[PDB]
Structure formats: C-alpha cells, structure tokens
Amino acid sequence: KVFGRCELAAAMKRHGLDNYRGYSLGNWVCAAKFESNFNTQATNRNTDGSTDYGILQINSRWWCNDGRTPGSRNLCNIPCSALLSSDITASVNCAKKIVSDGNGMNAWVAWRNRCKGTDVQAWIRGCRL
Ligand SMILES: O=C(O)c1cc(O)ccc1O
Ligand SMILES: O=C(O)c1cc(O)ccc1O
Predict the structure, then answer these.
(1) In this structure, what are the phi and psi dihedrals at residue 35, rounded to the nearest 5 degrees?
(2) Is 55 in the pocket of ligand 1 (CB under 6 A)?
(3) Torsion (CA) 125, 97, 110, 46 in degrees, nearest 10
(4) What residues have CB less than 8 Å from 86, skipping those under 6 apart?
(5) Where does the C-type lysozyme domain lie?
(6) After which residues is the chain broken (C to N over 2.5 A)?
C-alpha cells in the first residue's frame, strides 16, 4: 500500500507514535517519506547482505527474519514479510522497540540525514488528526 502523507500520519497516530519516546508525529512521517516513499512494500538490499523492509525500512540483520541474513537476531520476533503489509501494526510495534533501544531515531539513516534538524512539523501540516 502506498499511503498518502496525511493518511499515514493518522495511521501512525492511532498506533501510538505521536510523541513516542519524545518524537513528534512529523518525525515519523518524515522518516517514512525518505525511507520508503510511504510504500509498505518497499524492500532494499544492504551491502552486508541484509535487507530493509516496509515503510520504515526495518533491517533483517537485527529486527526481523527473512531466512537469508546470516547472523540475524530477529529481535521483533516477526517474519520480515510482516513489515510489508497494508496494516502497519507490525512495522509500528517493531519501530517502537528500535527507537527505545538507546539511539532513538538515529537508527534510521534517512531520518538522521533528511529529517533531524529540519521543520519536521511540516510533514503533518494540513492533516486532520
Ligand atoms: O490506523 C490505521 O491502521 C490506518 C490504516 C489505513 O489504511 C488508513 C488510515 C489509518 O489510520
Ligand atoms: O524526493 C524528494 O526529495 C521530496 C522532497 C520533498 O520535500 C517532498 C517530496 C519529495 O518527493
């Protein structure tokens, strides 16, 4: 599913990401924009052999099982394919674990390089929330 900007903001809010670990909703929308272009089906292979999955591009080396990433820890206890669903529940629950692990949203390269230090509130402006 390719979400609209405000559609995804509303879904993320309903699932508890607004101000989760202190990160306002616009941070999460901005991160999804630049990780996946709001596409739940996005997949991208990493140099190290792992793959990133879903709207928040969650990585198979640590967080989910894709059956082809040697050394994977599957810390979210899910198949990576669960991160590609039109239902964002699995992606959100796994993201909550990731963001809580001490490094915050710096875990997401696109957030660090394209959202952090910007007017992230812009990503939710005009949205019914
Ligand atoms: O909250 C959700 O899971 C949700 C899912 C959608 O497909 C669209 C809007 C939403 O708010
Ligand atoms: O592709 C981009 O860099 C981009 C940046 C924006 O601020 C808005 C939409 C986009 O597609």
Answers:
(1) -85, -40
(2) no
(3) -150
(4) 1, 40
(5) 1-129
(6) none
Q: Radius of gyration (Cα) for the chain, nearest Å? A: 14
User: Which value in Å is the resolution of this experimental model?
Assistant: 1.3
Q: Write out the H or E segment, with its range, that includes residue 89.
A: helix 89-99
Residue 116 · residue 105 · CB < 8 Å: yes
Q: Residue 61 belongs to a domain with what CATH number? A: 1.10.530.10
| 66 is a catalytic site residue | no
Q: Is 101 annotated as a binding residue?
A: yes
Q: Where are the beta strands (DSSP E) in the chain?
A: 43-45, 51-53, 58-59
Active site residue 35: yes
Q: Is 73 in the pocket of ligand 1 (CB under 6 A)?
A: no
- The residue contributing the CA closest to ligand 1 atom 4 is 11
Of all protein residues, the one whose alpha carbon is nearest to atom 10 of ligand 1 is 11
Number of domains in the chain: 1
Handedness of CA 60, 62, 65, 71 (dihedral sign): positive
Domain that holds residue 31: 1-129
124, 29 Cβ separation under 8 angstroms: yes
